[PDB]
Amino acid sequence: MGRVRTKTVKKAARVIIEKYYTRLGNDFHTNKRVCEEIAIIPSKKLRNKIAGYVTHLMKRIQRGPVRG
Amino acid sequence: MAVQISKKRKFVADGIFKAELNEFLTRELAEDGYSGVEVRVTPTRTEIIILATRTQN
Amino acid sequence: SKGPLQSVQVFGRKKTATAVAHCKRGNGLIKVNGRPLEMIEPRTLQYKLLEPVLLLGKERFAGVDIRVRVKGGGHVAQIYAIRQSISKALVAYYQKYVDEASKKEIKDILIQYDRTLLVADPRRCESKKFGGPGARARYQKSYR
Amino acid sequence: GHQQLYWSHPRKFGQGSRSCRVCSNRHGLIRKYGLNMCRQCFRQYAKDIGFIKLD
Amino acid sequence: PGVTVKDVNQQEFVRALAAFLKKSGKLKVPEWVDTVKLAKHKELAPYDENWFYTRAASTARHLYLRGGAGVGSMTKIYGGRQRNGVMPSHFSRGSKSVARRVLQALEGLKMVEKDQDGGRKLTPQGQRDLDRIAGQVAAANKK
Amino acid sequence: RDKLNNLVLFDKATYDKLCKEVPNYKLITPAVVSERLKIRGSLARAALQELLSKGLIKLVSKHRAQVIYTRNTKG
Amino acid sequence: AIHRIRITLTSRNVKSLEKVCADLIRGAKEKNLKVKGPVRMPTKTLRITTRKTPCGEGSKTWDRFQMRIHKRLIDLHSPSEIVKQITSISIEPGVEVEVTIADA
Amino acid sequence: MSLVIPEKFQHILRVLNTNIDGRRKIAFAITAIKGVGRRYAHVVLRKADIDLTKRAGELTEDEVERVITIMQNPRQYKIPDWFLNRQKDVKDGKYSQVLANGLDNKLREDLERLKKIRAHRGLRHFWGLRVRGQHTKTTGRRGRT
Amino acid sequence: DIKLFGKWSTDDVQINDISLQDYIAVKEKYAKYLPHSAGRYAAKRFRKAQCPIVERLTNSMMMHGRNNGKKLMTVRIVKHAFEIIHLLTGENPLQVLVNAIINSGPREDSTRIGRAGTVRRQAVDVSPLRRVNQAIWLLCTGAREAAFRNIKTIAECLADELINAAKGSSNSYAIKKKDELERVAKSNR
RNA sequence: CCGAUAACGAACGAGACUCUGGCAUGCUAACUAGUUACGCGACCCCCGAGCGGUCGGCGUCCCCCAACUUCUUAGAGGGACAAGUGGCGUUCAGCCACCCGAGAUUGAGCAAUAACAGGUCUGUGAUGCCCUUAGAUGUCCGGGGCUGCACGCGCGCUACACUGACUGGCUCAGCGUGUGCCUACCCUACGCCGGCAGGCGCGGGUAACCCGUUGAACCCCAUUCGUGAUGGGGAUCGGGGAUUGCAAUUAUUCCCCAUGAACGAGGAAUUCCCAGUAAGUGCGGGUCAUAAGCUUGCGUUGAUUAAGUCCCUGCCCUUUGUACACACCGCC
Ligand SMILES: [Mg+2]
Ligand SMILES: [Zn+2]
């Protein structure tokens, strides 16, 4: 309960999966480090949230065609 | 030593001085555009910078 | 025969009570604040202090001379720190001075019986608020 | 009055001895840390002094 | 198989030491042991006639665990709850006079001497006696 | 159930009553003997510890708040 | 020389105090002085809790004001004389310095 | 010896002009006397050399007269002068410990003494109000209704 | 093998009904030397099942304000009560406790909000965990009320309550309250 | 949030944020923090132990005359993301359970539009209008009052006891304060006198250096009591002794001896609370010459119950009705 990802974490996630699909992967840690050179994210709790939802899309985008 | 005030009272005193100085400058330089005061205090001598729009006033 | 510098120092902590157990190569001696482990303050909970040695065995400790220093918290809260220090010291001593296959067998006995002998309790206290006597309690309110 | 009773009453201690360093009030004073300031005045100048709000 | 007081039961040890002080009677017992109360927060006087021998045994033990203690430290160690009647309870320190003469009785017994700083500690003579009693309090407990 | 007026010192009738059947039943504590022999309770702790010294009653607990004894083994 | 000087710094914000701790020790390394590391004294928290209202009518709300005081010690102990070697403190507003030798 | 009740056992005594239960502990028996509390009982019995572990009934007639004479004359028996009641008397000045209907009439004597000069404390006593200056706003209602 | 309090082995007790077998924790896994462990047993739901029942009984004796944190006093109370029941009856004190819990848990209760006949409207069978929760609460209250103003100590009053509950003799406050709950539920079916 | 979609693109609030708690034997360091080692001692040993055991006894930054940062302090960093597995789900948003993990929801601070005839003119050299202004509604001084008691209510403290009280012994904290612009008033170690409250000299501390290893209480372990308004409870009241102050009566506070009252778990009602929580328990801060039954924080011991519902009291959204719009405390 209560772990819905706000617009910002989701909205940032989609941008960095279209800007940088090839570099990213399905690892939370590898992606959480790319999000450290591809974006100026003010908070650490924000990138890990952004990195977390990126995997959900990158896991999902490998199969289905997400709107990104 | 005994002459020196404790750091707890000391740092409160400097905040008191800045607040009192700001209030005095606020009332006096109000029509002159007084914006703020910066106090670069050094152990040798202190110094006070007045931030105002109309400096020639 | 006289190999020195074979020692570890592992702490244990419960509710702001910290106990550092000094492990060491010698004939089995377990002492807290210079007193024998049996001679301890609240003997009602004596078994909690003897609980680690009983589960693992006196023979495992026999090559180890432990001296725990404790200096925080209350009465019982200290005891949970002393046992956590002794249990975590031997697993560390067995970890870094013999094979961890021996560290594996000492760790599972303690982790199965009571994890607090190896992982600390993270709960501390709670801050009082300006509306009640305690952290969550509130002063009685009246409508007439 | 004459110079020997105008201020004759001793005021070495108590609420009468102490007043707010800003508004000259004698109620709700804060003598901690050498403030000697009013309960209400301190809230006004807390930011300037350095007393910020964390929790 | 040597013995030190930290290796024995403290509660039975102080009972043994007080007995040793009593039969070896040189302890300067004040004339008011029968009348006074051992602290301000105590509603009634001590039950045991030989309370001066038991504090002295108790305090001689305390100076072993940590030295440099004075009268102010003794009245803190022996201080306790004051129920204050209808008031909420508080902490009350012990009696300075009882603490002071117990210590004064101990220098007179040549087992306690003053420090280079404030307070007073155990002499090697007194430290010898504390740990022999510890020796016989463990043998009695063992067998 | 108004007031118990327990004995504070034994009478002859209760004293032999103590010595003949008290050391015969499993749970013997000062509370039990007080409410069975109508003794006050300080006498109960007293009488019980004298019977220990004679050896006709066995001690098991010996705690400040609860002291428990038992009868001697049979057989 | 022969001198040993204890430099104590005290401020309110950590960022400036940590900055000023850097250039003194970093300047001394270039000056090939010996530098004991900056000892961090426990932070002093001045806590003044004042009732939020100026009236006394309300819901008993209280306002918590905190003041953090951070102290740091740097011990510059070169073999040669030090006062001439370190003639600067290079501070920023908000941090107080107090040069002190071993005698005090 | 926790034996049969002693043949010369008095279930209550008659000390001074008050009867005290003999079934209770001696230091907690003479507390039934006005002017004698727990503290004063222990010091007198301490200085009368009587056993503390024995009840009041089993004290002998000579021991109960040693107890009384300690209480009546505590000054002569090394009991300190800070452990009495009528210390520094307002009429005769001598220090003493008062133990019976003498206590009830000394209280009455000082009570009329305040009334006779009609001091404020005497007036408060005469009107039946508090004399130690505590608030009468919301307490002490039971004594009136 | 673990010898709770240094004696009274746990590898011989048994639960007579499978309804309560998995919420009583006297077996080898939940066999402890001492009834004292800050194990965070209220963090989540059905974690008080894997809490040893001696610990559960100990946690319930500290009640009525005077005794809210005094677990060491309660541990010796359980310790002294267990010594009495073994001495007074002759079998394993844990075995008497499990029988007390089994025999005291009210099998049904009544609850509703509509216009009740006497106390509650609709008769509802209770859960196996409420069975244990009510059983422990009833025994402690029985021992508590029995020793509130008599010379008999808490350990002895706790001792007889478990002994009487382990048999069922209309003398234990717990079973008397249990039978009363059954009658109300039965009359309010 | 996902999605449909006469809406599209936005803004504030929520969230993010700030502080705090929990883990880092990983980094930086510490004679104002320590630990291990070594060397002196002091004791017990002695069989004989001897790298024996204990020491908050003393040294090795008294710089050449130990190391190291585990423990303490505080900075930079890391760490947790519903990340992994299984299930449910439009297989979207997400939910449930579990492994590994210190942690899989730690507490606070800030907190939108609109509004209230809510409270403050007794916080202000914030302020309009009105009033008074030398027999002052200014100001100062003396005394009294704000405490006054047939009675009603609210917040609490102490209790009704043996799961206890008493006497002795034992043994553990953490926030945090500490000598003053005016301004007089600091925290206290040690020694001596006294029974106590206290008094008298000698010091330390403007403070991780001194109080202080804050030897706290509850608790623990032994003693007495023994189901009685009792050694429960300490209200009321008498006498005496100290401290603060210019002054203690209408008792400032404290101490000592006496009296020992209601009160035997409290009707109808009603408050607060979900984990280190409630509650027991003490300790600091504020007030403070004198002082806490108050408040604000802190630690210590540590649970029962519940992981639900709209039944009561209310809140949010949609639909609906309306004679209501000062809005159901409405209208009639
Ligand atoms: Mg009494
Ligand atoms: Zn003001």
Chain H residue with CA closest to F7: the answer is H23
Residues in chain D preceding a C-to-N separation beyond 2.5 angstroms (breaks): none
**Structure token pair of residue B8:** 């707890």
Measured to protein CB atoms, the chain J nucleotides within 7 Å are 1-3, 14-23, 25, 28-32, 35-38, 42-57, 61, 63, 70-76, 78-84, 92-97, 102-103, 105-110, 118-120, 123-126, 140-142, 147-159, 161-185, 188-198, 206-208, 212-213, 215-241, 245-246, 249-252, 254-260, 262, 264-265, 271-283, 285-290, 292-308, 311
Q: Work out the burial of residue H62: count CB atoms within 10 Å of its CB; fewer than 13 is exposed, 13-18 middle, 19 or more buried.
A: exposed
Per the DSSP assignment, residues forming a β-bridge with F39 are F7
Q: Which of residues 8-27 of B touch D (CB under 8 A)?
A: 8-9, 11-13, 15-16, 18-19, 22-23
CA of D13 to C1' of J244 (A): 11
Helix, strand, or coil here: G97?
Answer: strand
3-state secondary structure H6-74: CCCCCCECCECCECCECCCEHHHCHHHCCCCCHHHHHHHHHHCCCCCCCECCCCCHHHHHHHHHHHHCC
CA of C25 to C1' of J38 (A): 18
Give the total number of structural domains in chain A. Answer: 1
**Structure token pair of residue G4:** 């040993």
CA of D54 to C1' of J108 (A): 9
* Type of residue at G76: L
- The CATH number, out of the four listed (1.10.10.60, 3.40.50.300, 3.30.70.360, 1.10.10.10), of the domain defined by the range F1-75: 1.10.10.10
What CATH number should be reported for the domain holding residue A26? 1.10.60.20
Distance CA I84, CA H31 (A): 39
Identify the experimental approach: cryo-EM
User: Are the beta carbons of A34 and A24 closer than 8 angstroms?
Assistant: yes
Give the total number of structural domains in chain B. Answer: 1
**Do the domain assignments include residue A67?**
no
Where exactly are the structural domains of chain I? 1-189
Distance CA C138, CA C140 (A): 6
CA H49 to chain centre: 20
Residue with tokens 């305690």: C134
Nearest Cα to Cα of residue F57 among F43, F71, F39, F46 = F71
CA of D36 to the centre of ligand 2 (A): 9
3-state secondary structure E75-95: HHHCCEEECCCCCCCEEECEC
Where exactly are the structural domains of chain G? 1-104
Distance CA E134, CA E127 (A): 11
**Structure token pair of residue G95:** 């941090």
- Is F65 at the interface with chain I, CB within 8 A? yes
**Do the domain assignments include residue B1?**
no
* Pairing verdict, β C7-14 and C17-24: antiparallel
CA Rg value for chain H: 19
Residue nearest to nucleotide J206 (CA to C1'): B6
Where exactly are the structural domains of chain D? 1-55
DSSP string, H85-133: SB-S-SSS---B---SHHHHHHHHHHHHHHHHTT-HHHHHHHHT--SS-
Distance CA I148, CA C114 (A): 37
Where exactly are the structural domains of chain F? 1-75
Q: What is the largest CA-CA distance in chain A?
A: 33
Helix, strand, or coil here: E13?
Answer: helix
CA E46 to chain centre: 14
**Structure token pair of residue F52:** 């220990």
User: Are the beta carbons of I164 and I175 closer than 8 angstroms?
Assistant: yes
Whether CB of E76 is under 7 Å from strand J: the answer is: yes
Distance CA F11, CA H2 (A): 10
**Taking an 8 Å Cβ-Cβ cutoff, which residues of chain E contact chain C?**
6-10
Chain F residue with CA closest to I160: the answer is F27
User: Are the beta carbons of E42 and E19 closer than 8 angstroms?
Assistant: no
Shortest Cα distance from I58 to chain C (angstroms)?
A: 13
Distance CA H31, CA H21 (A): 10
Distance CA I49, CA I60 (A): 15
Q: Which residues contact C103 (CB under 8 A, 6 or more apart)?
A: C91, C94, C95
Phi, psi of F18, deg, nearest 5? -60, -50
Nearest Cβ partner for F15 among H4, H24, H55 = H4
Q: Which residues contact E43 (CB under 8 A, 6 or more apart)?
A: E83, H38
Q: From the CB of residue E105, how many other CB atoms can be counted at a distance below 10 Å?
A: 22
Cβ within 8 Å, pair I87-F60: yes
DSSP string, C72-126: SS-HHHHHHHHHHHHHHHHHHHHHHHS-HHHHHHHHHHHHHH-GGGTS-------
What CATH number should be reported for the domain holding residue B13? 3.30.300.20
* CATH number belonging to domain D1-55: 4.10.830.10
Distance CA F68, CA F27 (A): 7
Residue C12 to residues A68, B18, C106, C121, Cα–Cα distance (Å): 50, 47, 17, 10
DSSP string, chain F: ------BSSB-HHHHHHHHHHGGGSS-B-HHHHHHHH-B-SHHHHHHHHHHHHHTSEEE----SS---EEEPP--
Distance CA G59, CA D55 (A): 18
User: Are the beta carbons of I109 and I124 closer than 8 angstroms?
Assistant: yes
* Type of residue at D47: K
**Structure token pair of residue F11:** 């009478």
Summary count for chain D: helices (H), strands (E): 1, 2
**Structure token pair of residue H56:** 């009041």
Q: Which residues contact I175 (CB under 8 A, 6 or more apart)?
A: I103, I104, I164, I165, I168, I169
**Structure token pair of residue G66:** 């905190």
Distance CA H59, CA H75 (A): 24
| Final resolution, Å | 2.2
Q: Work out the burial of residue C3: count CB atoms within 10 Å of its CB; fewer than 13 is exposed, 13-18 middle, 19 or more buried.
A: exposed
* Type of residue at F49: Q
Q: Which long-range contacts (CB under 8 A, 24 or more apart) does E75-80 make?
A: E75/E39, E75/E99, E78/E38, E78/E39, E79/E39, E79/E41, E80/E39, E80/E41, E80/E42
Distance CA D42, CA D39 (A): 6
**Taking an 8 Å Cβ-Cβ cutoff, which residues of chain H contact chain F?**
1-6, 9, 23-24, 55, 57-58
User: Are the beta carbons of F9 and H57 closer than 8 angstroms?
Assistant: yes
Distance CA I13, CA I96 (A): 9
Cβ within 8 Å, pair C51-I40: no
Distance CA H92, CA H112 (A): 16
Nearest Cα to Cα of residue I29 among I6, I49, I59, I43 = I49
